[PDB]
A paper describes a structure:
The relative orientation of the two domains with their respective active sites is relevant for catalysis and affected by substrate binding. GFAT-1 activity is modulated by UDP-GlcNAc feedback inhibition and via phosphorylation by protein kinase A (PKA).
We aimed to mechanistically understand the effect of Ser205 phosphorylation and generated a GFAT-1 S205D mutant to mimic the phosphorylation. To analyze the molecular consequence of the S205D substitution in human GFAT-1, we solved the crystal structure at 2.22 Å resolution. Ser205 is thus optimally positioned to influence domain interactions upon phosphorylation. Overall GlcN6P synthesis was decreased ~5-fold in the phospho-mimic mutant (kcat/Km: 4.4 mM−1 sec−1) compared to wild type GFAT-1 (kcat/Km: 21.3 mM−1 sec−1). Strikingly, the dose-dependent inhibition by UDP-GlcNAc was completely abolished in the S205D variant. Compared to wild type GFAT-1, the S205D mutant showed strongly reduced thermal stability of the glutaminase domain, as indicated by the specific reduction of the lower melting point.
Numbering used by the authors:
A (entry chain B): 2 to 227, 244 to 294, 304 to 681
B (entry chain A): 2 to 227, 240 to 295, 300 to 672, 677 to 679
The structure:
Amino acid sequence: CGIFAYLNYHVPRTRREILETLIKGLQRLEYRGYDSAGVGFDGGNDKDWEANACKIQLIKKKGKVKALDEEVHKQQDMDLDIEFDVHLGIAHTRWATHGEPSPVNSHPQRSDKNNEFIVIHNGIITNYKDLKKFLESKGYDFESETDTETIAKLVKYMYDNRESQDTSFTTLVERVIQQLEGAFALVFKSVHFPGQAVGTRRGDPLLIGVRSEHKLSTDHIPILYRTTCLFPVEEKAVEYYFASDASAVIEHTNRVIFLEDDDVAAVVDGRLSIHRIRAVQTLQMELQQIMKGNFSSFMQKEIFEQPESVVNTMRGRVNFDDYTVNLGGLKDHIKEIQRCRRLILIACGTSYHAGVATRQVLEELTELPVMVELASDFLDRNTPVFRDDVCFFLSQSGETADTLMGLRYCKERGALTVGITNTVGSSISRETDCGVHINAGPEIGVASTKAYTSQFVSLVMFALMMCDDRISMQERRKEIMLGLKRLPDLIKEVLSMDDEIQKLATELYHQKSVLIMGRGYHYATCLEGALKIKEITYMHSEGILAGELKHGPLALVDKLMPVIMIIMRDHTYAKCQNALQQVVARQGRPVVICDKEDTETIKNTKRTIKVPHSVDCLQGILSVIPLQLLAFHLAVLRGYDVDFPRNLAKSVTVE
Amino acid sequence: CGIFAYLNYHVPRTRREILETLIKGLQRLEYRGYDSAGVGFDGGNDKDWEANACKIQLIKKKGKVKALDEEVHKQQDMDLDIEFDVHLGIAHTRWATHGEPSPVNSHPQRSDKNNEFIVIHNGIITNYKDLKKFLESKGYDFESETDTETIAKLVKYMYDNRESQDTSFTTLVERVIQQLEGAFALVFKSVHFPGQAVGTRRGDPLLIGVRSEHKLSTDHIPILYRRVDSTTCLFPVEEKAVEYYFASDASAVIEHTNRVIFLEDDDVAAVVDGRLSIHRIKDHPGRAVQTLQMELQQIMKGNFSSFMQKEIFEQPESVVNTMRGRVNFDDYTVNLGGLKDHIKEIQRCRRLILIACGTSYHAGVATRQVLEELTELPVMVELASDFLDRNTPVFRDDVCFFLSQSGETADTLMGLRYCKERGALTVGITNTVGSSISRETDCGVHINAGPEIGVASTKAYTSQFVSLVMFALMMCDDRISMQERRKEIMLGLKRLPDLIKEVLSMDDEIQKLATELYHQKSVLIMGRGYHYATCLEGALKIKEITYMHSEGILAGELKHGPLALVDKLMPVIMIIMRDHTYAKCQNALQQVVARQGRPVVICDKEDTETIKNTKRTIKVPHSVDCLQGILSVIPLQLLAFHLAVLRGYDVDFPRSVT
Ligand SMILES: O=C[C@H](O)[C@@H](O)[C@H](O)[C@H](O)COP(=O)(O)O
Ligand SMILES: O=C[C@H](O)[C@@H](O)[C@H](O)[C@H](O)COP(=O)(O)O
Ligand SMILES: N[C@@H](CCC(=O)O)C(=O)O
């Protein structure tokens, strides 16, 4: 889900400029949830903007943001020409995991039929059922099936039983969160407090941007406990930007204030003050990073930019002149890591495949047991963990609920924890003892592509550090590092086969299933390839360990079943050729991803995808890219949007 | 593929009786699959059996053993009434590898047109190219494309170049195998050694059964290295009468006798003058005569129409057999006799590794959680093929379990030898007596589910499941804090046979589901926790038996991609049981329904909520959480069975040649 609000204080904006700002804000956050959207702004049609802050209009519609963009416009009651010197508007895009994505269930929610209080919410309230019964007895009627409504019906209950006639908006929100259980990120708006906003969080991101041509009173807001706020000095011109992510604010300003758990920010009279019952900083992001450029989709950009993102992952860490590796995030802990006795990798989805993809080389260069676990199952079994375990947590977002819960589980047992993330300041990067930022740049496509290859490389670099004191492994280290030096250019060679991959897609897009087979270093490749094809093309693709064919799954192969096989020139080549002969004996006609020089395979197979040869423990990077491209072209042929796959969104931060 | 030979020594048998014994033997070996079969025996219609020991007759044919039986009795120039006091007949079912199926490529292969030597062979001789060239240069002509023929020609080469006129049949075979490369099980017969047999193996099973109404000389045959006297071989003491049975599978011997000798690699067994001796080339090493508990009834369909149906519906009995003598339901204790001398060491180790293939691997996934809970040790579950590819680190304080119904699976066996070299304590969980994995592990447990004749693993899965739970119960038997948990689990084991019958009584409900999926090409099977393995195992069964694209999906992973497959057309089966993951499973159900999925749910009989909100539900009885996996997988076994029947497939049919 995504949160965005626009508060213009004494900055005259017309009602159109405001709505186009809310919509444009949801467009930046749409990849986090695109089942339904909605906005909340001040209604009425009075020239004097002051006589309009007593009427709250809500426009909510099912579908992507483009469905709300058109619902907002071409309306017969709203006059988009009213000038507002002061105004507050809130917006929200929802990932409807449960129930129907109906306008009633979308945000902002409301507290009554007159819209006295409206709130937008990211997260889950674990006790909303108790709150719902308590509020129903006091005379409040519920309309939607969402847990967010209990927050709106409750903030009004604290308002209908206050002690003084002028209790600050903060005091009301403070009493609410004390009754809420779970994780949440909230932004309130009310008619009683015109232009006032309140932002509190607890286990979910929520920052506050700010723009003003004038100077700010401070760059360090002092947190308070139940003059001294952030605001322009001489004049009042200020624009705030509440948001759950930075991509929605970077286009307007690069000055934000990342809140923390139970911090209740409040903008009053155009002054930001934090209450709790704190550091205006510059963002290191460029807008170009979250633009499609000349590509028609984000996913295509992020696939073709992998030559660059791989380089950025190694920048300032790998030195090819003297063959050294240094990960600054691990300098103070690498010594203690080497005294540990087991490595555990915990992650979800594609991030889990990155651990499968590097498990073998990690076992080789560290000589330690390496265990790779799906976060959800890791938690279900209450896996044993000990004080001399090193536990890695791979997460592009750094907020995945299952991976994050596994982190807190391993900390409670005294393990040394390491974070491999692509999001600075994320929960996983903050709560681990050390870690590495893969530095692949923002990923907007729902399906992770460059995050996978950058996680791959990051884990290889770690493996290189763990063995830099072994004489017997020096040549092996050099071999790997030379492969890393040549990897960006070999990726470019793979991308140049884009047209050849597209032609093969035209022969498969009509099929219902496809089996992808590989072993050894390329077990992860066929699992990741099968997940991508599932995710964006909706074909029933499955990854099958090649060594397991003879134990049952080979029965599913016939001349009609599509098959893709990975046969690279490493120590499993002969066994892979054996599996290929098994498939052919069952009349299968597979597409083979093989090496350019593999002349034997190229002659005896009609359809081959010839990738350049790299070091055996890096080849997985070059073998997965063809399957990234195949999934893209397959999705285009089937008429689906690669950036917005049905039934989900990016980053699973809730149950 | 299948070997069987019958040697009657001073037990008079007619030629008809001998041939009916060979045919009956091969009928016990058909379930392994084959394309051709043949037999070899003494021909000639001289009433004195002693004069016919120089004319070997062969009857080989492409097709099923039944057709071979017709060809036998369909011989005008053969008299079936001759009585042989001594005789050796051999028989073979072939699974073609080198040479296409045909009468010429069928076994027994011969050494020349006069049939001076014949041999039946299971396996492949790798260097059959080099050997064929050498024999062709010495003046030997081949008539088949089989690698086996080089064995028949080579033994004659050794005979034609023997230094002494009385070189033993054993010596000739020793020189043959010293020149062979690969895997083989062999039985030899020759006119120059009438009434004698020689069997040897390398990497392929070969056993010998014995029967006599007289006392035998010993139950432990000492090995002989390069004097054969009364004190070194097996024979009837006071009289000559005795019968020997060579076979590659005990299923072909058990109806005649239950006393068998399992040969080992490079053993050369020979019967000379009705006496059995075992030779090698290189405290007192020897081979034991042991008693199999196998019964002919265990390898017969009975009233069932298929072995798959039998083995699914007898799981109440096989589960009981797995627990017999091991779980005391009078004082609630567990004792696995196979681990008595090692349970002490095992409890001092620091990690458990389970290594297996296919369904046996799923049995490790199905018990990983309870093993972690009751042992408190790290438990790692590994597919044997990937375990080898990665050169997984293993240490001296690891306990490595090797799960294999057959006890012969190549990758699992190579995993075992890998772990032994690194000093790990090794444990075999097998269902085949005499198998390589049961012999080479430090200790082991025979799951005792009875022979598995069906093509897919059904009772072996649930019997492995139970065996590993029993081991987990042993490991925590000294912990006060776990007594209640152990009792809860053991009462679940006590009730499990009756709960399986209760699930089998819902067969009619499963048939209704099969008709719903009859026309479908894919189905997703979703679950988590204790039932992750149920999804993988059910998906494998439906793939293997029904040939449709079933896939197991970890429910906790849906929102990370796989949920995109859900719509109103994709069939889904979800497992929702009453354990600690119930709420999370309900969560996954709402995620599927919200996207137009209409899944079938396997749930508890008393889960009234899900039964009302879901159209079709398979309602199994509730058991202990770490045992529900057995009850929830059986509806998927039956589903695979019924779907295959509806589509006209032969569930007992397994489904290139150089
Ligand atoms: O293509 C699939 C997606 O990339 C998805 O499977 C992703 O890998 C998980 O959602 C993990 O999320 P994070 O690694 O970002 O926490
Ligand atoms: O239905 C599955 C089959 O039974 C097959 O997958 C089998 O489980 C493996 O070939 C392992 O065989 P073993 O149990 O003999 O090791
Ligand atoms: N390799 C031999 C025997 C194969 C077998 O029956 O296992 C052949 O093809 O004739």
